[PDB]
Every structure is written in structure tokens, then in C-alpha cells.
Curated annotation (Swiss-Prot), chains A, B:
Organism taxonomic ancestry: Bacteria, Pseudomonadati, Pseudomonadota, Alphaproteobacteria, Sphingomonadales
UniProt-recorded Gene Ontology molecular function terms: metal ion binding; tRNA-guanosine(34) queuine transglycosylase activity
HAMAP family tied to this protein: Q_tRNA_Tgt
Organism field: Zymomonas mobilis subsp. mobilis (strain ATCC 31821 / ZM4 / CP4)
The protein, known as: Queuine tRNA-ribosyltransferase
Keywords: Glycosyltransferase, Metal-binding, Queuosine biosynthesis, Transferase, tRNA processing, Zinc
Pathway in which this enzyme or protein is active: tRNA modification; tRNA-queuosine biosynthesis
Assembly behavior: Homodimer. Within each dimer, one monomer is responsible for RNA recognition and catalysis, while the other monomer binds to the replacement base PreQ1.
């Protein structure tokens, strides 16, 4: 396999299906990437992650740099060896979680300094250091380091942050290219910014295309804007990106968000399963989500979902999983996570097949009618 | 297979190796039984429990009767179906955990009433109700309901509790026998009491043998007495039990306790892996236990144990597991538990093979020399 090759096999409207070939494996698109935080996809062995259908996982740079540490992971042979996942890994830049999780942040044109939320130790990220950390981890797809644009953002502030992000995209490009081993074996994605503003999204797309990346993320969404607005921004934003490279919608999302985003030209997705306020009991089904903690499931012998081919739905009942989650048992988290990630992969497979067969628009309609019945 | 058949294939001193055949499967002895609390062996799918080598698991009646409930489990098809373990299950009587975990206990000749530690709901156990609950769960090996003798115990109090336990053993026997489905498909074990007193242990053995059981547990140990005293009590207590039935040492124990107990005629074991005060990081190795949380393991690329054939030792390093446990990750608990239970099964296999080959005494010496080096 080559370092990086994206091929589009079939199209329907703005939707595409195809493959990304990389040294560590082939990624089928549209793709969902399970999120590994601190070098683990929560409650799953890597072989189980693979069994669900995942071709690639995401690793969180911010968490990894804090624990166990990037240099340590490099000394130990890299993230793949460390956690036992031998297929592609995309690493984020760490910037988002610095803003959301850390304290005492000091931002500048050079980067950001911050205090760890674990022990208040002082750390730093910059375009150069982020790229270096992702190299030390042995990442296959490296994300350019950008500046977080909060939602909502004024036009001036959105513009300033986008402009800084584009300067940082060039710095990221140069850092990546100057490191021979990384340039020859990994890929680099740029991130479009500009908040909800069409003119800024266009300037950002133009800047990224001029620099040139292996793929293009739509950044700055999934931060509270709501689906209608997100879809509105995608409507104009995705066509601005180079057609012949993958389009990655960072942090998205719910099944219906994924379907609509694919309808708008997105090829790659990631998100973390909810846990707060009993949401860890949320199971996806083709008839919409259910919360397995609900008392109505206490004697329900049916599987989580009636069609799902996952091992959890083959072997255990709603009643059992209800009990485990209510009891706070680790096996509850294991089974819920395996089923939910398997559900997402089955959704992606149905999306890929429907685009390949020129019936994706019909699939989207059928999906929504049932999911929201 | 028959309802119950214990066959001794080989002996060395007081040690025995053989098989218990039951309807749901064959149990190799000496046997270690992983403990399932609330219908799960912590952090392991049943297929993983089986993969480690376990032939039988233990279920905790006290926990099951509180959550999800015995009647509910029966309605749902029994414990085996509920949790997805199709091999034999031994259930305890629930009595021990009533005393250790519940509150507002009221004890009498009839049984015990108590308040749940989960919600303060009021519950009851008696010889009859304990046997009934174990039936509702669909237990393969049913434990007679006895009265807990605390350590230390005065001779008078030890005698009184032992005498009550023997009356309750007869009540348990009769309850079990009066239920046709249970009598024909399950087995019933009696529990010897008498604390550290030889005369009481003898009276208890005689009473149990007169009633007649499928197996005999040595109760009242692993409650703070220390290994020397436990071994001293086993020295005189085990020979009092019928030779031709299994001997079950409840709640034991550490690897070295198991070896010494087999040397003294014990065939079956169970215990729960420690978790308190960082003990969840305790991994067994042939060179003694280690605590994986220790900083010295942070860059150690070796497996938990150098000889262990378990999947964890095949695939991940000490450094990785150190990180997971320090980070509080669920996968840490998964991997540690799988390795530790696999280690116990490998110990049992080495015990069985050495007895079969008439070299168990040598094995015990070699084991201790290395484990305590
Ligand atoms: Zn099905
Ligand atoms: Zn080995």
C-alpha cells in the first residue's frame, strides 16, 4: 500500500463512497472512527473494536501527552504497539481539549501554554510541538494544529481565529514535511474554520487548498449550534473543499447527523459515546435510541436491537444489560459500548452500500422515517 | 452425564485429582471457581471466563436475591440463560454476605431477617428460602444454609452455632429433596463448622455424614485466622469428611493457600480478587505477586508473567497495563482480571498434572521456593 491514496468508487448527489489506502490498512468511506482517549477505546479490546467493523480509530493527543506521555510512548515503540491496534490511527492535534479540559491557559500567536487537569503540571502546544507529539505517537493521519473558535463567535473574532488557524496550518505543513519519516509514512489533514460565516469558510478553504493537504476537516461544528445550523453551514462549506480529498467532520455525531452530513459530502466521522446523567445506558436501535436503565426493560428478553448483527445482540437480553448498567457492573459498559460501536459501523456499511447502489437518498429517507417514528 | 458423579483418578498423600460429572458439564479437580457476584464475573464475558480454563463459576445468592431478584431470574429462564454461562454454577447460601454486608439483622432458629444494603428493603433467609432461591436461580451445586461462626469464637458459641448449623443442614437436605426438579438435576453440599475446635469439627462431620450430602465444605475459615492456623484446622478437619465426596474450602484463597489446602485434601476453591487500597493492581506471577501500579513498571515491556499462556500476556505489556490501571480505565480491570483468573487456572492445571504424575509434593516445594524467593 501507498502512504496515502483516496479513491472515490461511487457517488450520489454530494455523497461519495470509496477507500483510503494507507500503509497500515484500507479505510472504507464514509467511515466512523471510534475514539481512543488515553490509548484505549473505552471498555473494548482492540480485537473487539476491529470485530465491530472499524478500519481506523482516533487517538486524543491531549490525553496521551499528559498520560502516559508522548516521549514515553515513543520509547515503548509507538501507540499502535502500546495499545495493540495495528491498523491506521488518526490523532487530533490536542488543541480542542486544551481549551475544554485544561486550566490557566495562555494563548498567543506561538501556541498555548496550559496546566494539566490531572496534576496542574505545566504543558505547551504549538503547531510544531503538536506535529512532533503526533509523530512520537506514530500517528497515521496527523491533524494540523488550529485555534478553537467558540460558538457563538462574532464575525471579527471568527475571522481572527480563522486567520491564525491558517497561519498555523502552514506551520503544521512545514513541520510535518521537515520530518522525513513522518512525511513519507503518514498523512496530514488541514482544518477549515470560519464559524457560521460563508465568506470566512471560503477564505479558509482557499488558504488550505493553496497549502495543500491529504484531507480536509470541517472544524468548528458540533459545539452547540444545533442540527439545522450545522447542516446549513455544511451546505456551503463542504463544496469549497477539494473534491478529490477526504472531508472529515470532526466530532460528529448522532446517527441522523451522520446521514445528513454524508448527504452533504462528508467522508469521515468521530464522536464519543455519552455517559453523563445515565446516558451511559443509551443504546442505539433502528427505531431510535433507548435508555436501557428504564424500568420497562427489566424483563425484556429481546436483544438491544432486533436486526443488529453484533455479538451482544446475539448473546444477551435487554433485561440482562439493564441489570448490569443499574448495578454499575463493568460488563454493562463493555456490552453497551460494543453494541453501540457495532451499530455505528452497520450504519456506515448501509450508507456505503446504498451510495454504491445509487439508492442512498432513499436509504436516508427510510432511515429517518423509522428512526424518528 | 449423570446428575452428579465424583471420580478420583489419582492420589498423592492426602491430595486427590479427578472429575465431577454433572448435567451441564465436567469439573476437573482440584478446581478453582471464579466468583460471579450479581450475575457477572467482574469485567469478563463468560466466554473469556471459559477461555481461562474455568469449568464452573460461583454465584452469590445474597447479591442475586437483592438485584435483580430470584423470582425475576426464574421468570427470565434462570441464571445460566440470564448471564450466558452454560456450564455448572455453584451458588452459596447467601448467609455469609447477610452477616457481612446487610444491616439490622435479626437472627433466630428459623433463619435471619435483614435490611438490604442497597435500599434498606427488608428480606429473609432460612434453610427453606435459601434452597428455594438457589432453585429459582437454577443452581447446579446448592449449598446448605448455615449460621456464620465469627473468628475468634469461644468454645460455647462455636458449639452452639455448629449445632444450629447441623439442624439447618437437615432442613436444607429436606427442602432440596422435596423439590423433585431440584433433587433430580442439582447437587447439595453440606458445610462443616466448629471453628478451630477438633471435637466440634468431628461432631459436625459426623452429623453431615449421617444426613448425607453430595459434597462437603469446610466452612468457617478464611476469616482472619492466618495460614498456620487454617492449615492446622485443615490437618484434622478434612480427614473427618467422607473420602469419596468432594471437599470444598470456601473463600480460599491466595495461591499458596490453595497449594497447602490441596496437600491437606481439598478439591474445590473460590475467592474474590482484591481491589481495595490499590490492590486492583495486584497481578499474580510465578515469582510472587506484583502491583502493576508501581512506578517501576511504567516502561517495562515484559508481560505480567514470563510464562503465563493467557491472552493478556501474549498481547500487552506491563507498561500498558500500568498506564490503564493508573488512569482508571475499564480495559485495565478487564486485562488484570483475565490474567489473574488465567493464572489461577494454570496453577490448578499444574496441581492436577503433578498429582496425576505422583510429583505433587515436589511441585509444591518448587512452587513455594520460587513464589517466595
Ligand atoms: Zn437479528
Ligand atoms: Zn510465555
Amino acid at each position: 500500500r501507498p502512504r496515502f491514496s483516496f479513491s472515490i468508487a461511487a457517488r450520489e448527489g454530494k455523497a461519495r463512497t470509496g477507500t483510503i489506502e494507507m500503509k497500515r490498512g484500507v479505510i472504507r468511506t464514509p467511515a466512523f472512527m471510534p475514539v481512543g482517549t488515553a490509548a484505549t477505546v473505552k471498555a473494548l479490546k482492540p480485537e473487539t473494536v476491529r470485530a465491530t467493523g472499524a478500519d481506523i480509530i482516533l487517538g486524543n493527543t491531549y490525553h496521551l501527552m499528559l498520560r502516559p506521555g508522548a516521549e514515553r510512548i515513543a520509547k515503548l515503540g509507538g501507540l499502535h504497539s502500546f495499545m495493540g491496534w495495528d491498523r491506521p490511527i488518526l490523532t487530533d492535534s490536542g488543541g480542542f481539549q486544551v481549551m475544554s479540559l485544561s486550566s490557566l491557559t495562555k494563548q498567543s500567536e506561538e501556541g498555548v501554554t496550559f496546566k494539566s487537569h490531572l496534576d496542574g503540571s505545566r504543558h505547551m502546544l504549538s503547531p510544531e510541538r503538536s506535529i512532533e507529539i503526533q509523530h512520537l505517537l506514530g500517528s497515521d493521519i496527523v491533524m494540523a494544529f488550529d485555534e478553537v473558535t467558540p460558538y457563538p463567535a462574532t464575525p471579527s473574532r471568527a475571522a481572527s481565529s480563522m486567520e491564525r488557524s491558517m497561519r498555523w496550518a502552514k506551520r503544521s505543513r512545514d513541520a510535518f514535511d521537515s520530518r522525513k519519516e513522518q512525511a513519507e509514512n503518514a498523512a496530514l489533514f488541514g482544518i477549515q474554520q470560519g464559524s457560521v460565516f460563508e465568506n470566512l469558510r471560503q477564505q479558509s478553504a482557499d488558504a488550505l487548498a493553496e497549502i495543500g493537504f491529504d484531507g480536509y476537516a470541517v472544524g468548528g461544528l458540533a459545539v452547540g449550534e444545533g442540527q439545522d445550523e450545522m447542516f446549513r453551514v455544511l451546505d456551503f462549506s463542504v463544496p469549497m473543499l477539494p473534491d478529490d480529498k477526504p472531508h472529515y467532520l470532526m466530532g460528529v455525531g448522532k446517527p441522523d447527523d451522520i446521514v445528513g452530513a454524508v448527504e452533504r459530502g462528508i467522508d469521515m466521522f468521530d464522536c464519543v459515546l455519552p455517559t453523563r446523567s445515565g446516558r451511559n445506558g443509551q443504546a442505539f436501535t433502528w427505531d431510535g435510541p433507548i435508555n436501557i436503565r428504564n424500568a420497562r426493560f427489566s424483563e425484556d428478553l429481546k436483544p438491544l436491537d432486533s436486526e443488529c448483527h453484533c455479538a451482544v445482540c446475539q448473546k444477551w437480553s435487554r433485561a440482562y444489560i439493564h441489570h448490569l448498567i443499574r448495578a454499575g457492573e463493568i460488563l454493562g459498559a463493555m456490552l453497551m459500548t460494543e453494541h453501540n460501536i457495532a451499530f455505528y459501523q452497520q450504519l456506515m456499511q448501509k450508507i456505503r452500500d446504498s451510495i454504491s447502489e445509487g439508492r442512498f437518498s432513499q436509504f436516508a429517507q427510510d432511515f429517518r422515517a423509522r428512526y424518528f417514528a
